[model samples]
Target: DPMVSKGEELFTGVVPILVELDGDVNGHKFSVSGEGEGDATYGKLTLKFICTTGKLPVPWPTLVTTFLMCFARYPDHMKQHDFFKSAMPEGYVQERTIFFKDDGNYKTRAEVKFEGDTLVNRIELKGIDFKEDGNILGHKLEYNYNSHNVYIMADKQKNGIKVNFKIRHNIEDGSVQLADHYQQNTPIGDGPVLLPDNHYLSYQSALSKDPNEKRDHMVLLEFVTAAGIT
Candidate 1:
């Protein structure tokens, strides 16, 4: 695909597929964990269920991703105890799905700018009302899925605004985290990632901080989603 390419060919990070799941539907309690992530072109899944047993109606909060992710190009018999089961031979480059659609229908978080060669793209949401660990109130949703073959000089530092390219999966209560990308190290702000308290705020797209990563022998089709799910 040519729109004038070369952002390292564009194939960002986040791919944690260890695999897991839980049960219950009518009773209302579910789970699915593979922790997904990939925002260079799109692909994210973050689900968390927690009903208090007596609260049913007044709820239309459904989600997407039963497992259909492909930000392709990271295969070479990939290791780390097996990342691919076999089938993809440089097949997909991008494939996403979101079933219904809500969050008012679009706009979460994305930022890339360089008004010179004419790379202007904008739209950042401001739903407001989130305070997880202070009182438990949520109201900042996003659902605008349509990003393409971007080669903004490979985002050397144009700033992705922080959605970090797109695939971010988080299935909780039942247990699941499909995958997620963008990390070469430079996550400066927001904490509580090892998980325990602060109601989980973790979201700091990396590319610096240098723990040392040259790509760590990339081969399996160029799989570099945080080096095959770190």
Candidate 2:
């Protein structure tokens, strides 16, 4: 049966960001703020960054120590219960998959699908045998779900560069917006990052106007169900 029908949901927050950069690396402006705690079975995922930049060379503690040493080993790739098992409940279609292997030749495969009504709510990734089995990076999300809201359509290019952007989100809470216009002809390539196309992140927080303070910010992000999910 291999059962796992919802349990484990916790979210901690303070994900405020606002960054703006344009072409070839020069016009930079940022006001990034992030503090995180994780759940949904991710167990441990912490993100810390407090940035205020000026053309980027050496500021904000060397750009937050070079982006926390390039995200301190990064690689949690995707979580949040993989987008709640890829939505679309009553209308059917709920496919969720994941795999990432490494031994000699790194391999990867990820999926989240729901194609029925207007048919377009997909997030896929592929790369096997090092890059030839179509090696796709597909992300086409356009949803409504009666009003939960979701939109993604911007800078839609793949291998010739010129990837512009657009994104809008809302599942219940409030706002989550992203808009970017990137210009990278070739110096290095590999895209499909919903927001970091040139720095502009803004996400303020709430909950603690002053409840005696000191829960230490990082607002609230929660799921709590893996038997109360901590």
Candidate 3:
């Protein structure tokens, strides 16, 4: 039996990611989670992020996903913030100034590339800016990827506020398992302990057995957050 549940699929060339934010932000402690998926070859892909903090700007998640994908696939396409402001989906990112506000919705962006045997990723995030009521601000993250394991880390400070995070992903045993850690000084806050048992992301790349099939099936579910279901 497959390690995953029925109707689930797997992919080897690309991996999906989940994020959690826990700990204290501004003066409040809360939990929020988001999800993202992409392929190494696509050069661009979308990400899905959600939160219960009510701070996420309208259509902000969609914009961040597209921007990250464009940066990975076509660097030239993401030159100006204004370009992103206009190119995003209709009604999303409608106001350009909101991009830099304390409660600004822009959150995460990243790129992955191969370096010999290592796959390195550069992640940028709008972590918490405590002075402005736990709003997210610019921060950096890094991840080292091997064939079946990934290690991610981030540590930084701005305006006397510290941001830190660490996570691990193991995908060697035909399934993907993830672990996350966050601390008080961390910028992105902490991600509460949780799992998407039923709503986990699925990706499959293996060829179908039938000889008549021309292409493999690629399926993805609509975006969702863990906060709502459990």
Candidate 4:
């Protein structure tokens, strides 16, 4: 044909890393089970977030989960879908980033355990990796972070960081007992976790702050059982 050109197509598809997690999970108090569905008590949950009140160099690429226990106990027409939204009235959720698709840059697995009278369900990612192609308006993200215990988020024009959150609760009735979150490698402090199934708020205290501890940020893990997270 002539120099006249035709439109081109761009695509993003699956690049599988085939290999099941060993032993397959079935022993004592700790085991892996990345299966199941969300019901009145269990299922895939997404996040509803907020930067709370921070200056520039904020945490980029927001990520979160659902699968909360409170959904099993607190059922209602209005109250069930309305916990932290009203309880923590500093204002609205600052951000709502959608980075939870299976074919994207994030992956996760679970460790279902027990503590005499609790269903200790904990989920950790396989790790996070991004490059020149992963920028989110504020900056271009580039990093290869390791560790399932790390909550990966980028700041600055971008800076990759590791954060961690721990939640405690019961199984028979799905009630939250406690939640702890902290920035493991920054003076950026820790955000607040509005629980049951919501988290990752702002860093308002001190210790520098993000490295601080107080009511600075507020994060709610609004569990939406739809995205089909099992």
CA deviation > 4 Å runs, candidate 2: 1-32, 40-148, 153-155, 158-210, 214-218, 222-230
Candidate 4 per-residue lDDT, tens place, 1-230, comes to 11011000000121111111211111101112222222223222222222333321212222223213222212232232222222221211211122322212323443332223232334443323333232322233221111122122433222212335542322223432222334322111132322223222221111112334343322222233211111
Worst 10 residues of 1 by lDDT: 192-201
Candidate 1: tens digits of C-alpha lDDT, residues 78-190: 22111111112221111212211122111122222223322221222222222332111121222211122211111225221112233332223332222222212111223
What would the TM-score be for candidate 1 when compared with the true structure? Answer: 0.19
Which regions in candidate 1 have their CA more than 4 angstroms from the true location? 1-48, 53-61, 65-103, 106-230
lDDT winner, 1 or 3: 3
Which 10-residue window in model 4 sums to the lowest lDDT? 2-11
Relative to the true structure, candidate 3 reaches a TM of 0.25
lDDT of 2 by residue, 8-106 (tens): 111222212221111111222233334443322322224333333323221221111111101111113322222222222211111111121210121
TM-score of 2: 0.20
The whole-model lDDT of each prediction reads 0.23, 0.22, 0.26, 0.25
Identify the runs in model 4 with alpha carbons over 4 angstroms from their true place: 1-61, 66-104, 117-119, 127-129, 136-218, 221-230
lDDT of 4 at 20: 15
Q: In model 2, what is the error at residue 145, expressed in angstroms?
A: 19
Clashes of each: 40, 16, 8, 23
lDDT of 3: 0.26
Better of 2 and 3 by TM-score: 3
* Tens digit per residue, CA lDDT, model 3, 1-230: 22221101222345554434332433344334444554433432334334456543222221222222112221222222111112211101111111232233223433333233223334334434423422232111111221211111212232111112222222334432222222221112122111112111112111112245232211222221111112
Model number with the top TM-score? 3
